[PDB]
Design a protein around this ligand. Structure first.
Ligand SMILES: CCCN1CCC[C@@]12CCN([C@@H](C)C(=O)N[C@@H](Cc1ccccc1)[C@H](O)CNCc1cccc(C(C)C)c1)C2=O
Length: 380
């Protein structure tokens, strides 16, 4: 049932949201990062300084070695391992067990995160971007093929400001997790969860770029990336606008590069001097769109380091990209996001843990209409 799946996620945007899974027979329990931005299921399978536990293949009587190796480089971080198959379950997900491909990670570089409390990654996107190639069936494809679970899942990621980290509902939509309307944008191509941004405003001001620039060379929805990542041209305009709005305050060298912290005395963060970002997503009807609005409570990411805890400190959670737009975890937070694979669309609604203060709130609003008939997609 959906209610049994509520609050089955832990973690945070900075180190990742994870769900409990089991692999092997008898079941070995591992925490697994939920990643809509890739398509490999992989688990630590040998000792590593940052691993609290790992998958022990020799103790699973249902493990089968595929006798093939695999290497996966992400935007940052990489791992290598041996491919196999084994039985997999999600204790607080659907009440099923399936046989799935699993990469046993034996070497890695800047992949595992110290103190993150996860030991593997669940790539929920499509086969086209699976490694070594699209012939390696992703987990969710196996789940749907082997069970009666409907072909969709939804994510409610919740920030620290608004333990439980959120919900992954597999097989359906849980109405108790959102309010207002659910607005859908088409999945442009089934590889990443690729979508199209048709307009960007910062504090109500249109960036007035050719909309193809917003999607150079693709835009994706990616729970495994912390930040909003923007193409160079768009990033520069966004930073310029946010700087101009917040110009009553002077920020450190390196803050805007996402590297350096800014801190305020407890409770005094000047949210009001930072603008809202509106991303308008292509709608299901020609030249209609809807917008999701992003508050600074989202794109200024709090750090929870004990050493800095006397004050409220943040990193700038918007980064320059050379591989297209990424709507990462800080964007997904506060929204209920429905990955409707069956109907090739992604839905957004205001979530029960939505971000707001007394003056402003994250929102999903529509429809908007545009006169220009240009296809905002970068590729056909
Ligand atoms: C949980 C967030 C941890 N955070 C905190 C530190 C920065 C990082 C780690 C790497 N990363 C991004 C830049 C990333 O590459 N994510 C990976 C997942 C990941 C990597 C390393 C550690 C944890 C999570 C994601 O999958 C990218 N999708 C597009 C993408 C880009 C390039 C190649 C691919 C293929 C694998 C299909 C996908 C982050 O945001």
């Amino acid at each position: 049932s959906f209610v049994e799946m509520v609050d089955n996620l832990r973690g945070k945007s900075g180190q990742g949201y994870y769900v409990e899974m089991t692999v092997g027979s008898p079941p070995q329990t591992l925490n697994i990062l939920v990643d809509t931005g890739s398509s490999n299921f992989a688990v630590g399978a040998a000792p590593h300084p940052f691993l609290h536990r790992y998958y022990q293949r020799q103790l699973s009587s249902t493990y089968r070695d595929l006798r093939k190796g695999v290497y996966v480089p992400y935007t940052q971080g990489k791992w290598e391992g041996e491919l196999g198959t084994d039985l997999v379950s999600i204790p607080h997900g659907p009440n099923v067990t399936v046989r799935a491909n699993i990469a046993a990670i034996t070497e890695s570089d800047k992949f595992f995160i110290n103190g993150s409390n996860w030991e593997g990654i669940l790539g929920l996107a499509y086969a086209e971007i699976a490694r070594p190639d699209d012939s390696l069936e992703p987990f969710f494809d196996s789940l749907v093929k082997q069970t009666h679970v409907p072909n969709l899942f939804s994510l409610q990621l919740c920030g620290a400001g608004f333990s439980v980290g959120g919900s992954m509902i597999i097989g359906g939509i849980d109405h108790s997790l959102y309010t207002g309307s659910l607005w859908y944008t088409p999945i442009r191509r089934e590889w990443y969860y690729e979508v199209i941004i048709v307009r960007v405003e910062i504090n109500g001001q249109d960036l007035k770029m050719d909309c193809k620039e917003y999607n150079y060379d693709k835009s994706i929805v990616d729970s495994g990336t912390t930040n909003l990542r923007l193409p160079k041209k768009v990033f520069e305009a966004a930073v310029k606008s946010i700087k101009a709005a917040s110009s009553t305050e002077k920020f450190p060298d390196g803050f805007w590069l996402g590297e350096q912290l800014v801190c305020w005395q407890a409770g005094t963060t000047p949210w009001n001097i930072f603008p809202v970002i509106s991303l308008y997503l292509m709608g299901e009807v020609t030249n209609q769109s809807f917008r999701i609005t992003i508050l600074p409570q989202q794109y200024l990411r709090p750090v929870e380091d004990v050493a800095t805890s006397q004050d409220d400190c943040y990193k700038f959670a918007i980064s320059q990209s050379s591989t297209g737009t990424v709507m990462g975890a800080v964007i997904m937070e506060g929204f209920y996001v429905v990955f409707d694979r069956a109907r090739k669309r992604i839905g957004f609604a205001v979530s029960a843990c939505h971000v707001h203060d007394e003056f402003r709130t994250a929102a999903v609003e529509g429809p908007f209409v545009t006169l220009d008939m240009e296809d905002c997609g970068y590729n056909i």
